[PDB]
Design a protein around this ligand. Structure first.
Ligand SMILES: *[C@@](=O)([C]([C][C](F)F)[N]C(=O)[C]([C][C]([C])[C])[N]C(=O)[C]([C][C]C([O])=O)[N]C(=O)OC([C])([C])[C])C([O])=O
Lengths: 175, 12
């Protein structure tokens, strides 16, 4: 892996339950990728062109807690499994890839960067298999080309007997 | 309930 990543936690359970109910987040936002949580799930959002994108099966139609109260989705597409909120200011916006590289890198919730071989518009194989438990909570995270540009957003693991051999992703064109 | 930002990944 060429690209590197680290994470910073910003809230714990209590602030989270309360921030969900107020919809008001005063924390400073930073980073390309936001770690997100709702009552029942945990997932990621990738910032691209000033929009925070994530999976619909995680966010559904919910607002995002922001510094002025709840942020309404700017984009909701149930069939592509894709939603986007205007990025809070502070988020570092990435830029869509284009170059057509097929050496790809998935950023996970634990800030690991793993090598993916692009196989189709919305599919990739992992060069080494991983438990699927290791991928849980990373839906919405970025698939990057070697230059650090975004080709897509992770949607679903292709797996058997709890091991993931490939990933389904939403191509940056859909965005 | 709103979705909440509980952390962030810093890319480099
Ligand atoms: C994301 O939500 C991931 C979590 C991680 F990959 F498991 N996405 C999902 O869990 C999706 C959700 C559906 C509604 C798209 N499902 C899958 O990842 C499943 C694996 C379930 C299991 O292990 O048996 N894969 C799947 O459905 O793949 C095909 C090819 C059929 C689309 C995370 O949790 O953050």
């Amino acid at each position: 892996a060429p690209i590197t990543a680290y994470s910073q936690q910003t809230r714990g359970l209590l602030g989270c339950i309360i921030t969900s109910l107020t919809g008001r987040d005063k924390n400073q936002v930073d980073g390309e990728v936001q770690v997100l949580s709702t009552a029942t799930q945990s997932f990621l959002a990738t910032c691209v062109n000033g929009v925070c994108w994530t999976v619909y099966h995680g966010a559904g139609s919910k607002t995002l807690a922001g510094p002025k109260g709840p942020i309404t989705q700017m984009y909701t597409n149930v069939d592509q499994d894709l939603v986007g909120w205007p990025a809070p200011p502070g988020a570092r916006s990435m830029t869509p890839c284009t170059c057509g590289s097929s050496d790809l890198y998935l950023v996970t919730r634990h800030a690991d960067v793993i090598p993916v071989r692009r196989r189709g518009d919305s599919r990739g194989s992992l060069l080494s298999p991983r438990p699927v438990s290791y991928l849980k909570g990373s839906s919405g995270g970025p698939l990057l080309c070697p230059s650090g540009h975004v080709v897509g957003i992770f949607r679903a693991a292709v797996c058997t007997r709890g091991v993931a051999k490939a990933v389904d992703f939403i191509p940056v064109e859909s965005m | 309930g709103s979705v909440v930002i509980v952390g962030r990944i810093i890319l480099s």
